[PDB]
């Protein structure tokens, strides 16, 4: 008979900007594409980029609390990893050089924590660069870039093959076995990408299984998702000179938001009219040289450009998990009247609350 | 179509532990898996009750057969345990409590297998609590019936399907059955390999594998022993396992002037540790032998030699005859020493120590 999911939840972590290790590029595109594919399969997804050790530990611990009886969970990690004494570790962006196991997340410890859950299906996919829980563990490993090799937005090897099979209505073990076979058919993969599948799945479970809504347990999961996806409402700021500026917000990842400013009305007597954002909380570590760009791409934002209106100034806030209080910042306006030489200045402070992952209370 | 350069298998079943509870399922499970693998054209060596050094030597010699393109299968049934995320196979001489140093680390064996250019490497653990293409089945459980794992495995093993798909079906059958025992499958298989793939020989490498198999399966020829009194006794040999041979005696001819006579075997090498109270039985079952009873003639006396891996030199033993002439009261005794060479696993030259 048809297997069903009580619910479907997923946590995706992509680490790229390492303080003491080579920077990676594939986790950005891989996490974004996997988020959209899992959304088509009706997963409630939280996707985080560039997490420190404590951030990673807190995110995994909170994901594990959602794993009630019958729930389908998926944890995906892309970034640096390593093996030591038969144990594999996920490397956070603040890890020292050389790698110390105390500063990394032990994959085996997470599998043991998952083993204690009564989940319908638990999928743990590691895309690293070097009474049953129904756990399926996909361990993909690739070599680090060659220092003297020639290096757009390309997918990593594993995600390239996984995205072609992930939407299939087949048992997840069968599906991953097909992925391993596709990679074995390619000669370019033969020495640069490996895949090991560990499974204790005893039932025909698939990511496409339907979901079985007003219970407290169900509401807790919906509420965590809803908070993590909450963007500030758009604001129309009215200045004394008559100029009106709209402040817009778009989501790229659960901890990455794009802010844009647009001139909605400029009185005829005003010619120059620059609106820009400033005074961001110090926790976010925003470099002002990268804020107020003429295009979203100049802020390092390539994936949500479709959902952004043109003729704005864009700013990328990419460390929202470090925001411990409300997001308070300033919108400055620098303008010049027709027939006059001096530039006039004005500003207003805005409070847009706790956006996206920050709504879950960061500590 | 995928092909195997050759198909080799080593099956170990541990039951009679010195310091741990005795097990029964490995006897039946090893025997049944041997016959199924033989139908799939595997060259199989199946050993029972191995000590630490015996297990290490057998695994090391099995790993030497794993040349490029070969399909290997290693099966272990017996006590096992997990410690620090590592699993260990427990030999019959292991002390209590368990120790990593006295047991075989499963992960160390997987690492040794990882270095081979095998076409397919299957490692199945049935425990009681150029890629290598490794598929690892890890079954754990907490009376002549099969063990749980082998019961489900034997219904699927002969299928012409990819070994990973086949083991996934086994895990699903156990998940349906209320009776069930856990199963974890670890795989790095990137090609469509199956135990049913055909074998693709006169090369030296091919001949080395055939020779190891041939030696491990060599039984002594049947013998007709002729005694001075005219009595003739036929001595027979049957294989139950690679280290377990059944010996049987029968009176083929008794001269009319001999009113009664009995024959029996004695003086086995001390390495074999044969208890004479268990030898010369009227039925094979009384010797602890019930799997090969079909291939044994009736009305013989049976003796089970079950530790052939401990035989260092030729198997030399005595056939005694006690008889009585018609018209006489006293019983006449006679005996003949018999040398049957090194049978089965003993033909591979058994030694003290490691390597
Ligand atoms: N530097 C400051 C700092 C230190 N720690 N943290 C921190 C604390 C808490 C979290 N919590 C979190 O991610 N919760 C998610 C887990 O994934 C899913 C998946 C599905 C659904 Br439905 C809901 C959720 C909820 C994250 C962080 Cl990064 C910040
Ligand atoms: N206490 C005395 C003592 C100590 N060590 N040993 C000992 C030494 C060597 C072996 N060698 C062994 O079993 N070789 C087999 C391995 O499996 C296969 C599989 C397929 C084919 Br084709 C051929 C073979 C050859 C066994 C033992 Cl028990 C005895």
Curated annotation (Swiss-Prot), chain A:
One of its GO terms (molecular function) is protease binding. Residues 13-209 are annotated as: Caspase-like. Keywords: Acetylation, Chromosomal rearrangement, Cytoplasm, Disease variant, Disulfide bond, Hydrolase, Immunity, Immunoglobulin domain, Nucleus, Phosphoprotein, Protease, Repeat, Ubl conjugation pathway. A motif (Nuclear export signal) lies at residues 34-41. Homooligomer; forms oligomers which bind to TRAF6. Forms a complex with CARD14 and MALT1; resulting in the formation of a CBM (CARD14-BCL10-MALT1) complex. Forms a complex with CARD11 and MALT1; resulting in the formation of a CBM (CARD11-BCL10-MALT1) complex. Forms a complex with CARD9 and MALT1; resulting in the formation of a CBM (CARD9-BCL10-MALT1) complex. Protease that enhances BCL10-induced activation: acts via formation of CBM complexes that channel adaptive and innate immune signaling downstream of CARD domain-containing proteins (CARD9, CARD11 and CARD14) to activate NF-kappa-B and MAP kinase p38 pathways which stimulate expression of genes encoding pro-inflammatory cytokines and chemokines. Mediates BCL10 cleavage: MALT1-dependent BCL10 cleavage plays an important role in T-cell antigen receptor-induced integrin adhesion. Involved in the induction of T helper 17 cells (Th17) differentiation. This is Mucosa-associated lymphoid tissue lymphoma translocation protein 1. It comes from Homo sapiens. The chain holds residues 336 to 718 of 824 of the full protein.
Curated annotation (Swiss-Prot), chain B:
The active site is at residues 79, 128. A motif (Nuclear export signal) lies at residues 33-40. Residues 12-197 are annotated as: Caspase-like. It comes from the Eukaryota. It is linked to Immunodeficiency 12: A primary immunodeficiency characterized by onset in infancy of recurrent bacterial and candidal infections resulting in bronchiectasis and growth delay. Manifestations include mastoiditis, aphthous ulcers, cheilitis, gingivitis, esophagitis, gastritis, duodenitis, and meningitis. Levels of absolute lymphocytes and serum immunoglobulins are normal, but specific antibody titers are low despite immunization, and T-cells show impaired proliferative responses to mitogens. A chromosomal aberration involving MALT1 is recurrent in low-grade mucosa-associated lymphoid tissue (MALT lymphoma). Translocation t(11;18)(q21;q21) with BIRC2. This translocation is found in approximately 50% of cytogenetically abnormal low-grade MALT lymphoma. Belongs to the peptidase C14B family. Homooligomer; forms oligomers which bind to TRAF6. Forms a complex with CARD14 and MALT1; resulting in the formation of a CBM (CARD14-BCL10-MALT1) complex. Forms a complex with CARD11 and MALT1; resulting in the formation of a CBM (CARD11-BCL10-MALT1) complex. Forms a complex with CARD9 and MALT1; resulting in the formation of a CBM (CARD9-BCL10-MALT1) complex. Protease that enhances BCL10-induced activation: acts via formation of CBM complexes that channel adaptive and innate immune signaling downstream of CARD domain-containing proteins (CARD9, CARD11 and CARD14) to activate NF-kappa-B and MAP kinase p38 pathways which stimulate expression of genes encoding pro-inflammatory cytokines and chemokines. Mediates BCL10 cleavage: MALT1-dependent BCL10 cleavage plays an important role in T-cell antigen receptor-induced integrin adhesion. Involved in the induction of T helper 17 cells (Th17) differentiation. This is Mucosa-associated lymphoid tissue lymphoma translocation protein 1. It comes from Homo sapiens (Human).
């Amino acid at each position: 008979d048809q297997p069903l999911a009580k619910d479907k939840v997923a946590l995706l972590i992509g680490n790229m900007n390492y303080r003491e290790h080579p920077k990676l590029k594939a986790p950005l595109v891989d996490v974004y594409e996997l988020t959209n594919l899992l959304r088509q399969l009706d997963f409630k997804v939280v996707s985080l980029l560039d997490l420190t050790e404590y951030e990673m530990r807190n995110a995994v611990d909170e994901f594990l609390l959602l794993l009630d009886k019958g729930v389908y969970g998926l944890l995906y990690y892309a970034g640096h990893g390593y093996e030591n004494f038969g144990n594999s570790f996920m490397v956070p962006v603040d890890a020292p050089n050389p790698y110390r196991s105390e500063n990394c997340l032990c994959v085996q410890n997470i599998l043991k924590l998952m083993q204690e859950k009564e989940t319908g299906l638990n999928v743990f996919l590691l895309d690293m660069c070097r009474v049953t829980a129904n756990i399926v563990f996909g361990y993909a490993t690739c070599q680090g870039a060659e220092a003297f090799e020639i290096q757009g937005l390309a997918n990593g090897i594993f995600m390239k093959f996984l995205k072609d099979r992930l939407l299939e209505d087949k048992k997840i073990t069968v599906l991953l076995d097909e992925v391993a076979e596709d990679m074995g058919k390619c000669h370019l993969t033969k020495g640069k990408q490996a895949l090991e599948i560990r499974s204790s799945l005893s039932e025909k479970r698939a990511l496409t299984d339907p979901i079985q809504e007003y219970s407290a347990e169900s509401l807790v999961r919906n509420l965590q998702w809803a908070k993590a996806h909450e963007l500030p409402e758009s604001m129309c700021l009215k200045f004394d000179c008559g100029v009106q500026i709209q402040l817009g917000f778009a989501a790229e990842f659960s901890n990455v938001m794009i802010i844009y400013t647009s001139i909605v009305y400029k009185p005829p007597e005003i010619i120059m009219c620059d609106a820009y954002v400033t005074d961001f909380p110090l926790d976010l570590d925003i470099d002002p040289k990268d804020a107020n760009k003429g295009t979203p791409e100049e802020t390092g934002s390539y994936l949500v450009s479709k959902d952004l209106p043109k003729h704005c100034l864009y700013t990328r806030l990419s460390s929202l998990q470090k925001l411990k209080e409300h997001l308070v910042f300033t919108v400055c306006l620098s303008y010049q009247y027709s027939g006059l030489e001096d530039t006039v200045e004005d500003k207003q402070e805005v409070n847009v609350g706790k956006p996206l992952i920050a709504k879950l209370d960061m500590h």
